[PDB]
Amino acid sequence: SPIYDINYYTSEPAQKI
């Protein structure tokens, strides 16, 4: 269920993206 929170890969490159 907490798979939706696995998008932290995006939450990391806050500066990159």
CSV table of C-alpha atoms in Angstrom, one decimal:
chain,number,residue,atom,x,y,z
A,1,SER,CA,0.0,0.0,0.0
A,2,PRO,CA,2.8,2.5,0.8
A,3,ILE,CA,4.0,2.0,-2.7
A,4,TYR,CA,2.7,5.5,-3.6
A,5,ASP,CA,5.3,6.9,-1.2
A,6,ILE,CA,8.1,5.1,-3.2
A,7,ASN,CA,8.3,8.1,-5.5
A,8,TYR,CA,10.9,9.7,-3.2
A,9,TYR,CA,13.2,9.1,-6.2
A,10,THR,CA,11.6,12.3,-7.5
A,11,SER,CA,11.6,13.9,-4.1
A,12,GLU,CA,15.4,13.8,-4.0
A,13,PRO,CA,16.2,15.6,-7.3
A,14,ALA,CA,14.2,18.6,-6.2
A,15,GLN,CA,16.9,20.7,-7.7
A,16,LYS,CA,17.5,18.5,-10.7
A,17,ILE,CA,13.8,18.6,-11.6
